[PDB]
Amino acid sequence: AQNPNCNIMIFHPTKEEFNDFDKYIAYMESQGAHRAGLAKIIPPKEWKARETYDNISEILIATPLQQVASGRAGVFTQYHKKKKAMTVGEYRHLANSKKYQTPPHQNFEDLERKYWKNRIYNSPIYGADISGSLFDENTKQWNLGHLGTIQDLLEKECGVVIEGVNTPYLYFGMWKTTFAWHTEDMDLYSINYLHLGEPKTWYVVPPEHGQRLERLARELFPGSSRGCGAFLRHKVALISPTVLKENGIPFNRITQEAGEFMVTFPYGYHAGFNHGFNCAEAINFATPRWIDYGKMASQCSCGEARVTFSMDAFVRILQPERYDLWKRGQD
Numbered sequence: 209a210q211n212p213n214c215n216i217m218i219f220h221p222t223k224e225e226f227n228d229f230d231k232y233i234a235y236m237e238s239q240g241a242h243r244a245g246l247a248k249i250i251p252p253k254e255w256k257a258r259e260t261y262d263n264i265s266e267i268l269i270a271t272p273l274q275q276v277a278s279g280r281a282g283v284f285t286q287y288h289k290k291k292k293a294m295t296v297g298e299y300r301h302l303a304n305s306k307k308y309q310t311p312p313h314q315n316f317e318d319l320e321r322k323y324w325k326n327r328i329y330n331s332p333i334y335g336a337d338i339s340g341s342l343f344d345e346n347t348k349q350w351n352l353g354h355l356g357t358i359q360d361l362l363e364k365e366c367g368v369v370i371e372g373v374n375t376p377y378l379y380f381g382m383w384k385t386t387f388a389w390h391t392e393d394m395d396l397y398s399i400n401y402l403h404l405g406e407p408k409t410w411y412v413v414p415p416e417h418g419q420r421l422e423r424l425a426r427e428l429f430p431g432s433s434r435g436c437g438a439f440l441r442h443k444v445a446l447i448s449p450t451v452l453k454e455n456g457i458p459f460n461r462i463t464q465e466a467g468e469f470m471v472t473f474p475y476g477y478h479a480g481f482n483h484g485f486n487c488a489e490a491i492n493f494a495t496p497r498w499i500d501y502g503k504m505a506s507q508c509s510c511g512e513a514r515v516t517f518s519m520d521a522f523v524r525i526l527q528p529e530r531y532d533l534w535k536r537g538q539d
């Protein structure tokens with residue numbers, strides 16, 4: 209069995225190996241990369257996502273989200289308070305202000321310590337989940353706006369044609385902006401490219417151990433657990449590495465820098481934070497190996513998780529018994 213300790217693997221494809229996306233994912237899996245839940249892909253030196261980032265300031269963040277925390281430093285939830293619209297140039301200036309900027313630090317480890325110690329005492333503003341792309345149309349390799357669609361994969365594997373579309377999302381971050389512990393909708397893969405700016409730190413639980421994380425979360429968030437049998441689908445709970453270590457939960461950590469891709473694998477729980485002003489692009493995708501995860505994915509039916517149009521068909525075809533209850537949650 210490849211990668212039996214479920215370590216995060218880093219890949220350096222050549223420009224020739226960067227042509228065929230599906231084939232490279234399958235290669236990474238042949239080496240055990242999925243066992244970690246997360247992999248890093250450093251593009252060949254010849255590749256670029258676009259020519260420059262000099263002209264992005266007029267993109268609109270229609271609903272910036274202020275991430276307000278409740279709890280204790282290592283075990284907290286966050287809610288998102290909607291703020292007034294602002295441009296990317298206005299958001300960059302805000303991120304760089306004295307109130308929000310990254311503090312002085314020695315190295316990534318010192319910054320990580322400061323994040324865990326102090327996150328809860330601040331409410332950073334995240335420009336998350338903005339439909340769009342920063343890949344140039346002429347970039348042919350690993351262009352997240354030109355991937356094979358999940359609907360087409362379901363049709364190729366299962367023979368059923370379904371409605372829905374699959375497009376990328378932009379994330380504009382600042383110091384302390386946070387992504388809570390989650391797997392993807394329908395336990396899909398995700399791919400994330402850090403276009404510019406400061407790093408993003410990730411934490412991940414191997415898929416084979418995801419239920420250990422769920423059991424800890426039910427213990428640590430006991431009211432949430434009673435409200436919903438899949439409350440981590442709400443994407444609001446944070447648990448620190450120190451707390452995970454104290455409770456024996458297997459995980460790994462890695463920092464992504466500008467110009468690097470991350471792939472999350474089906475049922476790989478992940479969480480993390482931004483080091484300073486940055487912009488990432490991400491999209492979900494599927495492979496043949498996903499189908500079995502999609503059929504077994506948990507679902508939130510309490511009404512909180514509220515998701516895209518295109519998840520309807522995935523539930524309806526892969527999980528027909530759950531469909532009725534899940535759709536009640538959506539309505």
Ligand SMILES: O=C(O)CNC(=O)C(=O)O
Pocket residue numbers: 379386387398399400472478488490491
């Ligand atoms: O970058 C973020 O805020 C969150 N991203 C992801 O969870 C992902 O790419 O799967």
Ligand SMILES: [Mg+2]
Pocket residue numbers: 263264265266267
């Ligand atoms: Mg612009």
Ligand code: NI
Pocket residue numbers: 390391392398472478
């Ligand atoms: Ni994710």
Ligand SMILES: [Zn+2]
Pocket residue numbers: 435436437438439441442508509510511512513
């Ligand atoms: Zn729920």
